[PDB]
């Protein structure tokens, strides 16, 4: 509110930085004007972080192994390198799946080459081949192997592509080498791009000549939904209620056969544009499959997306969509009637990764809650182009915010609720401000769809209005 004070706050916050750091950071903070369609004139993104400023961004390995390849349940993913990277990323992301872990599913397990000094000095391609043999011996029901490279693999002269080719020819198994070394790029976005390229080059085209799959005019594939807390499932039950058939979902609860069957669908429904736009566009160019973005956060966005998707098919699909909307109307109406009075008028600040900082605005507004500030760790300029129209006037936008910047912004704006990751949760809890984890749903959820909206509203109500926030000050002080 009152744009000039927001600019004054930005200047006051930037006053502490050195000249180079302040010049760089001035470009990544902006005041929203909804009429602006080109975000390059106000905010800059997808650049390197300033050293020593305590950024929140991850690495390309997190973007590829932790986000894209990890949810694939029937595949075994080898963290090629030292032990740390696979260990810190093991089961940290709630990409839900159905399977028997250790036999035919391996999502929550940590496979690594566990590099030692001799591996660094002399390379680890022979170790990689021996590891692949051991994996084949001890996990016979796996349907594929991916090799996710960590930093030393890129640094030393290792050639994992030739090893993957030789071993895949020898054992007749799909082995996908991913060069997702953490020093590449500036964030997880390059990891997304590298993982998409690997999927395109090694997995997607296996069934190009296969025509044994029976296709229907209602074949769609969910792209960029990773089943956080079951989110994708909560989406799927709606799409099948509309009369459509979901052949595949990428990549939460996903199987390699689903990915290989994806080029046979009629329509691609992309939830996370940021992480899967590469493969969606490639599929459009090569197979002629149209793709479209949708939003299932909140009843309004869900209804709009359902109608837009139904508009792509015949009359029966549209009638079924209307039936689904009518069936689910009373439930979310009751949820709103129960929870909006306790949440109306509250102000929220968000700082999340590439998609959610703009996707969940509608759900908050459905509860009578208003977003004062939003930002991204690693989004590109098109994400901000969408965000500027999705956000309100004179609100704050921040790209790759530092801990000091975010703390100062929160201290001045004083929001009622903050949605961010685990690395700000306790910082802002000690400040006396309710916090919701917007990556893992605070180990709750799902939040997608009509079923997820009730859980979302309940969680926001339970955290915002908890009595604990009234007891931070001692009565004698």
């Amino acid at each position: 509110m009152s744009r000039e004070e927001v600019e004054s706050l930005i200047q006051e916050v930037l006053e502490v930085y050195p000249e180079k750091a302040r010049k760089d950071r001035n470009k990544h903070l902006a005041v929203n004007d909804p009429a602006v369609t080109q975000s390059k004139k106000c905010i800059i993104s997808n650049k390197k972080s300033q050293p020593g400023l305590m950024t929140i961004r991850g690495c390309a390995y997190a973007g590829s192994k932790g986000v894209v390849w990890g949810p694939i349940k029937d595949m075994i993913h080898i963290s090629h390198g030292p032990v740390g990277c696979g260990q810190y990323s093991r089961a940290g992301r709630r990409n839900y799946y159905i399977g028997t872990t250790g036999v035919n599913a391996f999502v929550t397990m940590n496979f690594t080459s566990d590099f030692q000094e001799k591996d660094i000095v002399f390379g680890g391609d022979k170790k990689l081949a021996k590891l692949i043999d051991e994996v084949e011996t001890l996990f016979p029901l796996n349907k594929g192997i991916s090799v996710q490279s960590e930093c030393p693999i890129g640094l030393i002269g290792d050639d994992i592509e030739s090893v993957s080719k030789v071993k895949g020819a020898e054992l007749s198994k799909t082995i996908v080498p991913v060069r997702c070394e953490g020093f590449r790029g500036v964030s997880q976005s390059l990891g997304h791009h590298i993982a998409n390229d690997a999927v395109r080059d090694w997995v997607l085209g296996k069934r190009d000549e296969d025509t044994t799959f029976a296709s229907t005019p209602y074949d769609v594939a969910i792209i960029g939904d990773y089943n956080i807390g079951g989110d994708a499932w909560s989406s799927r039950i709606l799409l099948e209620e509309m009369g459509l058939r979901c052949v595949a979902q990428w990549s939460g609860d996903g199987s390699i056969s689903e990915i290989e069957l994806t080029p046979k669908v009629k329509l691609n429904l992309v939830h996370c544009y940021r992480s899967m736009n590469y493969i969606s566009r490639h599929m459009e160019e090569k197979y002629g499959i149209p793709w479209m973005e949708y939003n299932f956060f909140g009843p309004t966005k869900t209804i709009e997306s359902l109608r837009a998707i139904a508009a792509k098919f015949d009359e029966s699909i549209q009638k079924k969509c209307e039936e689904v909307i009518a069936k689910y109307k009373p439930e979310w109406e009751a949820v709103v009637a129960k929870y909006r009075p306790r949440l109306e008028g509250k102000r929220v600040m968000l700082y999340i990764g590439g998609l959610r900082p703009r996707h969940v605005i509608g759900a908050y507004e459905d509860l009578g809650m208003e977003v004062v500030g939003t930002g991204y760790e690693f989004a590109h300029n098109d994400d901000y182009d969408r965000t500027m129209k999705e956000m309100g006037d004179s609100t704050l936008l921040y790209d790759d915010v530092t801990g000091y910047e975010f703390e100062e912004f929160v201290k001045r704006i004083k929001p009622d609720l903050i949605g961010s990751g685990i690395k700000e949760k306790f910082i802002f809890q000690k400040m006396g401000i309710p916090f919701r984890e917007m990556h893992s749903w605070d180990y709750s959820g799902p939040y997608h769809g009509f079923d997820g909206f009730a859980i979302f509203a309940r969680d926001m109500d339970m955290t915002l209005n908890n009595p604990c926030w009234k007891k931070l000050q001692a009565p004698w002080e």
């Binding site: 502490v16 930085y17 050195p18 180079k20 750091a21 972080s49 300033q50 050293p51 020593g52 400023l53 929140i56 961004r57 690495c59 029937d74 030292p82 032990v83 740390g84 990277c85 260990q87 810190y88 028997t100 250790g102 036999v103 035919n104 397990m109 940590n110 496979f111 566990d114 590099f115 030692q116 000094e117 660094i120 170790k127 021996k130 590891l131 994996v135 001890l138 029901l141 349907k143 930093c151 030393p152 640094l155 953490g182 020093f183 079951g230 499932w233 039950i237 199987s255 056969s257 439930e331 949820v335 690395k423 306790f426 802002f428 000690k430 006396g432 959820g445 009509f450 079923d451 000050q473």
Partner: protein, 522 residues
């Protein structure tokens, strides 16, 4: 569907009939899943001794490790000093993972910065990154000290930390008098405890190496305490309390308890407590230095004996009755202070608890894992209680530590059926607990999956997990517990005996089937 009065999260919402039908259709239509009978056969095969023989032949594949990399331990060591910023020279994903790991364990803010080295530095080095990062960190977060460790990227490209920091001081990026200790922490060597050791040695060398002329041993009448990689705040608290009861002057080096337990009173404190620079400078003037976890403080021991000329005692970790007694006696001998009556009464109370619980504790079989010092202290205390350790696993252990643990086992008839494994991961331990079933496991949160696997074989084959160690992610506030001293022994005994009693109560809750042994009094 959702009812507004009773809203269901993912469990048990996805147990609804419509979701079940949807998942069945999905699996039967597009997953191309193996038949369930094949899955059952493969699982049963993985539970067999032949599968264990195949599993233990592994030489190039690691499955579910029980260790981390050095910079995590270096960051934990750096956090223990007053107003000190941990600074990791290398890539930022490492720092993100470190902070997330420690946030999930401690449920507290963790401060740590990186210079965000990228593909450009992969061929030029990270000198400019170090200069700009030091300047930015000092300007922004205002630390009194910056402790620099390294990621594997800078280790492979071979960046020279000393030259980089000296050049940063020379060109005026940060003041020449600003303390910037450094240490190389390669992730492909050792584990996180090695990183802790390297960071502590680097800090001590920075603060004491060049000013040893004026130091006199025993002049300040204090005892230095080096705790090592420690994730229980109660351990620091109990060490301080026991030293204070004895009336012994002490200096705890790398004390992170205050910064890891800040109150929630409306303000955020980035720094709190910690070892001061004056204490580090005055450390060589102490009577002696005591290392709480000697098996990952070898480099620190070498520096302290070689340079400070302190005659470091050969003490085990002060875990359990006998080793707590030995630690107290050695401290008394060094400081000249008698052991007070309160500690004697506390020891007697621990002995009373042992006598009270011996009947339920006797003969129980445990598979345990963790860090070397903690594992051997737990084994010693289990032998003291009359329990039988059967599978002892230490991924980051070495052959000398294994020899020491074997010697400890050979001195007790309860260690007759014990095997010590070094370099093995939790898949090996899963095979071992399937083929040689113990009564309980003791370990970190990663053990829970193993328990699930055992429950999949049958209720009669399930091995319950007891959460002692690091990290613990699925329980709240267990990081406040104590494992050192008599208080830690009391807590461990209570946890073990009550876990046994809950398991017995669960096994005998069946009405008219097993509830004849559902005794009110135990």
């Amino acid at each position: 569907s959702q009812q507004v009065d009773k809203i269901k999260a993912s469990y048990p919402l996805f147990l609804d009939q419509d979701y079940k039908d949807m998942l069945a259709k999905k699996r039967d239509g597009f997953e191309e899943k193996y038949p369930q009978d094949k899955i059952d056969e493969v699982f049963q095969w993985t539970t067999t001794k032949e599968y264990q023989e195949l599993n233990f032949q592994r030489e190039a594949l690691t499955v579910n490790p029980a260790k981390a990399c050095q910079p995590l331990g270096a960051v934990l060591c750096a956090l223990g000093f007053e107003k000190t910023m941990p600074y990791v020279h290398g890539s930022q994903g490492c720092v993100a993972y470190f902070r997330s790991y420690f946030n999930r364990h401690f449920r507290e803010p963790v401060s740590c910065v990186s210079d965000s080295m990228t593909e450009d530095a992969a061929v030029f080095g990270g000198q400019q990154n170090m200069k700009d990062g030091l300047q930015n960190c000092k300007a922004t977060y205002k630390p009194d000290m910056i402790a620099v460790s390294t990621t594997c990227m800078a280790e492979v490209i071979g960046d020279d930390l000393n030259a980089f920091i000296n050049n940063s001081k020379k060109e005026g990026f940060i003041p020449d008098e600003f303390p910037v200790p450094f240490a190389h922490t390669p992730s492909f060597v050792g584990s996180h405890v090695t990183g802790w050791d390297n960071m502590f040695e680097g800090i001590a060398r920075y603060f004491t190496l060049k000013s040893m002329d004026d130091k006199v041993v025993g002049s300040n009448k204090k005892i230095n305490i080096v705790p090592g990689f420690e994730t229980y705040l109660g351990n620091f608290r109990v060490i301080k309390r026991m030293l204070s009861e004895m009336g012994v002057g002490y200096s705890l080096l790398s004390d992170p308890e205050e910064v890891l337990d800040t109150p929630a009173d409306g303000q955020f404190r980035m720094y709190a407590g910690g070892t001061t620079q004056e204490e580090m400078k005055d450390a060589p003037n102490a009577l002696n230095t005591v290392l709480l976890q000697p098996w990952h403080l070898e480099k620190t021991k070498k520096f302290v004996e070689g340079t400070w000329k302190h005659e470091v005692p050969k003490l085990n970790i002060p875990m359990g009755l006998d080793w707590t007694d030995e630690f107290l006696m050695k401290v008394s001998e060094i400081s000249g202070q008698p052991i007070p009556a309160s500690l004697t009464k506390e020891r007697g109370r621990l002995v009373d608890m042992m006598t009270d619980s011996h009947t339920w504790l006797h003969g129980k079989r445990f598979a345990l894992w963790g860090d070397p010092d903690f594992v051997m202290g737990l084994v010693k205390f289990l032998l003291e209680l009359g329990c039988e350790p059967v599978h002892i696993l230490c991924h980051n252990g070495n052959k000398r530590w294994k020899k020491a643990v074997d010697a400890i086992l050979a001195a007790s008839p309860y260690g007759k059926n014990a095997t010590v494994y070094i370099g093995k991961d939790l898949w090996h331990l899963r095979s071992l607990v399937f083929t040689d079933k113990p009564d309980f496991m003791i370990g970190n949160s990663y053990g829970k999956f193993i328990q699930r696997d055992t429950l999949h074989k049958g209720k009669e084959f399930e091995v319950p997990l007891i959460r002692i160690g690091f990290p613990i992610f699925d329980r709240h506030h267990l990081h406040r517990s104590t494992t050192l001293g008599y208080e830690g022994a009391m807590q461990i005994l209570t946890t073990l005996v009550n876990s046994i009693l809950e398991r017995l109560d669960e096994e005998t809750r069946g009405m008219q089937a097993t509830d004849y042994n559902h005794d009110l009094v135990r």
